[PDB]
Each structure stands twice: as structure tokens, then as C-alpha cells.
Design a protein around this ligand. Structure first.
Ligand SMILES: [Fe+3]
Ligand SMILES: [Fe+3]
Lengths: 336, 313
């Protein structure tokens, strides 16, 4: 899997740029910053821009990493106890800006209106009260792998994860599809509309309000999918090198479809066995193609003392206007 | 409709940039040019970048124009007789490169393998071979991977022949009609008409579809009246369609792209039409260049022969 290792000169240049922009703009609340993002991203080292452009256009490998960034630990400060109530932007604004620049080289940053106050860059660090069950703000318990929001027609196209700190080198898991491990028979079944993919609870329209025609319409397409339960494929794009959408937990293989069950079981085994540990250590930025890779998290014991692992996360869409029906305005980048 | 007028300084910077790139790269057949496009486009004047970005993100206007480019008429040379068989790139390469730069600020340039020999930049000039009815449409309205934007660069336009552009005024339509238009009740048929891999026709015709989509309060549209039909029994969908056509037809505007203007059309918010005009056929005729822009190249992968190709079909 190709990666890019920054020279110390490149790391210094990236660091300087992010400090300059952090001083020049107030916050991501600034509409002008969001406008300026792709032009600003053109100020990144040329080798870096070339590398990500190649990754994007090759449409072959499902993840890549850019390693060796300089993330100033003294400036960044202690890992917070919670995301709620923090001053925004924080002293790690330069790192958030970096990830937004990278998102602009790949597409458009976007978010989910109900998640982390609508912030475009999410925090990933342990929160003591969240210690019980499977999520990003946890630690103690496993996070099995999946395509992000597999059921959703406007799911992320890419995900960008930047490791601000990771003292105990807790890796992330990512897995791709080795198509040669699957029979042509199984591939054809996986390309057919034979599977049901259920939404995560956070997407269910009965989660939110029932007032006004405007918001009802914002969830009408998802409601329709819940009501009609359309069957869909797990593989798509090119038969020779396919995209996938695989969330085992939310996937139903219809009981009577014996061929869909055989093929699904073969697909699951291939992806499960191909899972890899990718460490995103301090200064590493991991890029995940949500159409070619699944991702997961490993459990770890947190210290809750301001020294814990801290990642930042940005979701990327190749086509912001596609999701217009689920966005409250044309300008907003938040769905819901 | 917002527009941007280049200073002479900006016009000179753009001209110089396009000449430089034309010498640095061999053709659009060069994969490294296609890679470098977004980074190269960031070398355009910052006011121009900001303006197009604002248009893209505003998602409000159906078109915009950047005016006052310096298109060297001597270098561009005479308007050709035809596109077919013509050696590419020609002397007007710098102007084609400009539109490609613009396309990279908006999205990705793409084309149709069966249109103008699969060239990424199309030619629009009078061709000798030819009661002219006046029509308008969304580009490739039937197609799920149709253009998101269109870019028309006017290399020359001596008689100031306009293009028609029409947007949707909602206030004229009932909430009832809008709801029906949002529903999949309409048929839109395809336009005009290598050996491998799985011959030609792959992901073909299937279901009924809507004409309006996106926000219920400020909808996008796909409207090609000539190729649009409604099942006879569906009287509501027929009524709503008639009303939509009337609104769009009545609001049609003439937009002139004169020499040095680049017109940008949002294929989701605007329909466009061409206007008949008398040509001279003497090498001095109106000459536009056209590039098609997709917001999401990967979405069309199933209709593209390889991962690298930007040609559908
Ligand atoms: Fe996830
Ligand atoms: Fe057209």
C-alpha cells in the first residue's frame, strides 16, 4: 500500500502554513475559509498534492497514509475530557485546518447535523462516561469493521483521520477486497440487488422531530428506504475491480436466498482475513476510500488524564449537491 | 446574474499562463496534464478562482460568465470547416487548456466516447452540411451521469449570436404540481446514438424518474421536452409537467457569449438552447469550445472502460 513520508523540510513547510492560516482565519464558522480551502491546499508541498491526486485518480488502493507531520505537542495541549463545552477553535486549530486542506484536495468536507455540535472536524479521544460500548469516543471495548454508513446514498466517499497523539501506538484496522479470492459466480451474486442494508439508529427519522413539512422532506428518502426495504448490491462499479459497501452488523441476507448467503459468507471471510492494523502514530494522517476499504477500531484502556490518544476526523464527499434534499440550506455542509 | 470582468492585468496573466501550459504539455492525451489540472488552475488569478468557487458553493444561479479574456485571433486562426479528421491540438490549444483549468475548479472534465471522436473539448462552429425550431434542454437529461456543469468558451462571435438559458421560477407553480414532479412518473428517452469489452450497450434503460429533485423549496431540474413523455393514464403528472414546461419556456433568456467570454451553465439549475444563425462559412464564423464537468467521476465508473478514462460509453 503506497504511502508518503514527509522530509523534515516538507513537515516544517506544512506546519508553517497551518499556523499562518490558523492566524488568518477565525474558525470554520468563517464562510470564507470554506470557500478558500482548495486554493489554500495548493500551497501544500507539491509532492504531497501530487501524491494525493494520484491516489484519488488511480481509484485502486483503498487507503493511504502521509507520515511525518510536525504536530507541536506543547502548542496542542492536553487531550480534552470531552468535546462538549470546549472553546472553538482550540489550540489544535492548525491540525484541524490541515485536515480540511486535505479534504479539499479530495472533495468537499461535510458532516452530520446531530453529530458533535455539527463540527466538520470531529474529535476522537476517550470520554470516561462513554466508556461502555462500541463507538469513537470510547476505548475499553472493540469496534468491529465496516464501511461507514453503508446503507446511506450520501455516505462519505473518503475519511481522513489525523493522529494528534497516540502514546501507546494503538493502531486502526483497515481492510480491502482481494477480488482474486472470490469466485466469478459469487462476484456476480454480490453485484445483484439481493441484500438489505439497515440504517444505524442515528439515521432513523423517528430519532428527530415530526414538526413542519420542511424537515419531513429532509428525511423522506431515508423514510422511504425504511418503509420499502429495497434490496441492494454489496459490490458495484467495475466487475474487474469493484467498490464495496459492507457493514456486517446492519446487513441482512434474505433467508431463502441461498446463493446470496453463500456469496456473502465468502465475501465476509475474504475481508475479515484481509484486515490489517495500520498505526496512525503522532503526525500520521490516514486516508480511507469508503468505497474500497472497511475500517474498525481496537479496544484500549484509557488514562483519562489529558495524555490519551487523540485523533481528528473529517468526512469527505465527492458531490455535495447530491445530498441537497437532506441539507437545510444550499450553503450548509451538514446532513440532517 | 453575477459575472466577473477581468482587468487587462488579469487577462494578460491568464493568456500567459495558457500559453505556458500549451508549451509544457503535448495534448490532453497527456495523463500528467490531467493530473496537474487542479494545481495548475490554482495559478489563475485569485479573483477568478474565488468567483467561480462562490458560484459553485452558492448553488443559487443557473449560469455565470467570466468576461474579458484575451483570445489571440491571429494565433487562433480561421474557424475550421469541420471537427472530424482535424489534427488535435490546434493553434487554439491555450484556450482549450483554459476551459480545462476552469473545469478542474468546478469538478472533473469528462466526455462521451461517441461524441466528436471522444475529445474532451468539443467544437461548436457552423458546418457546411446544413424551418429551424427553437428548443432547449438539460444536457443529457435521461442519463444518471449527465454533466453537472457546462463550460462554453467563445473563441469568436462576430454577429453576437446569443445562447438561450432558462432557470426555474418556483412561485409560478403550485405545491401540488411540485410534489408530483418530485415523484418518479416521467420517461426521458436518450439523445443521438472500439469492439470490447462488453459491447457498447451495458447499463441500459430501466425505470420512470422525477423531473424535479434536491430541495423541495429550491429544486434542481432535468428537463428535455422533446424526449420527455408521461404515461397517458397519469393525468396528474401530465398536468404538472405542462405547468413546469410553461414556466421554464416563458422564463428563457438570451445570454451572449462574445469573443473572450466564458459562460458557465449549471446543468441542475438551468436549461440551455442554441439559436439558429446565418453562417458565412468563410473561416470567420462564430466558434465556441465546450467542456462537460462532473462533480463525481467515480460515480460513472460502470460506464467507463477503465479507471483512468474520462470518457463514458
Ligand atoms: Fe466507522
Ligand atoms: Fe445542449
Amino acid at each position: 500500500t503506497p504511502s508518503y513520508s514527509l522530509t523534515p523540510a516538507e513537515a516544517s513547510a506544512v506546519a508553517e502554513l497551518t499556523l499562518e492560516l490558523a492566524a488568518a482565519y477565525g474558525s470554520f464558522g468563517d464562510p470564507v475559509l470554506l470557500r478558500d480551502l482548495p486554493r489554500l491546499a495548493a500551497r501544500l508541498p507539491e509532492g504531497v498534492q501530487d501524491f494525493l491526486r494520484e491516489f484519488k485518480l488511480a481509484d485502486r488502493h483503498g487507503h493511504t497514509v502521509i507520515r511525518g507531520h510536525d504536530f507541536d505537542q506543547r502548542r496542542i495541549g492536553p487531550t480534552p475530557d470531552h468535546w462538549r463545552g470546549r472553546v472553538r477553535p482550540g489550540p489544535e486549530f492548525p491540525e484541524e485546518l490541515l485536515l480540511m486542506l486535505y479534504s479539499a484536495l479530495l472533495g468537499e468536507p461535510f458532516g452530520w447535523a446531530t453529530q458533535q455540535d455539527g463540527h466538520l472536524v470531529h474529535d476522537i479521544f476517550p470520554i470516561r462516561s462513554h466508556e461502555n460500548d462500541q463507538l469513537g469516543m470510547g476505548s475499553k471495548q472493540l469496534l468491529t469493521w465496516h464501511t461507514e454508513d453503508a446503507f446511506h446514498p450520501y455516505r462519505s466517499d473518503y475519511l481522513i483521520l489525523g493522529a494528534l497523539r497516540n502514546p501507546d501506538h494503538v493502531p486502526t484496522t483497515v481492510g480491502e477486497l482481494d477480488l482474486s479470492s472470490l469466485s466469478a459466480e459469487d462476484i456476480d451474486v454480490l453485484f445483484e440487488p439481493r441484500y438489505h442494508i439497515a440504517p444505524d439508529e442515528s439515521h432513523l427519522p423517528k430519532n428527530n422531530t415530526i414538526a413542519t413539512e420542511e424537515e419531513a422532506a429532509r428525511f423522506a428518502t431515508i423514510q422511504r428506504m425504511i418503509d420499502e426495504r429495497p434490496l441492494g448490491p454489496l459490490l458495484y462499479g467495475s466487475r474487474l475491480d469493484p467498490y464495496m459497501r459492507l457493514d456486517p452488523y446492519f446487513t441482512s441476507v434474505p433467508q431463502d436466498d441461498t446463493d446470496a448467503r453463500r456469496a456473502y459468507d465468502a465475501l465476509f471471510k475474504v475481508v475479515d482475513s484481509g484486515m490489517r492494523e495500520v498505526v496512525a502514530d503522532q503526525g500520521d494522517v490516514l486516508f480511507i476510500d469508503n468505497h474500497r476499504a472497511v475500517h474498525g477500531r481496537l479496544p484500549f484502556q484509557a488514562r483519562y488524564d489529558g495524555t490519551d490518544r487523540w485523533l481528528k476526523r473529517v468526512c469527505v464527499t465527492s458531490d455535495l449537491r447530491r445530498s441537497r434534499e437532506m441539507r437545510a440550506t444550499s450553503a450548509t455542509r451538514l446532513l440532517g
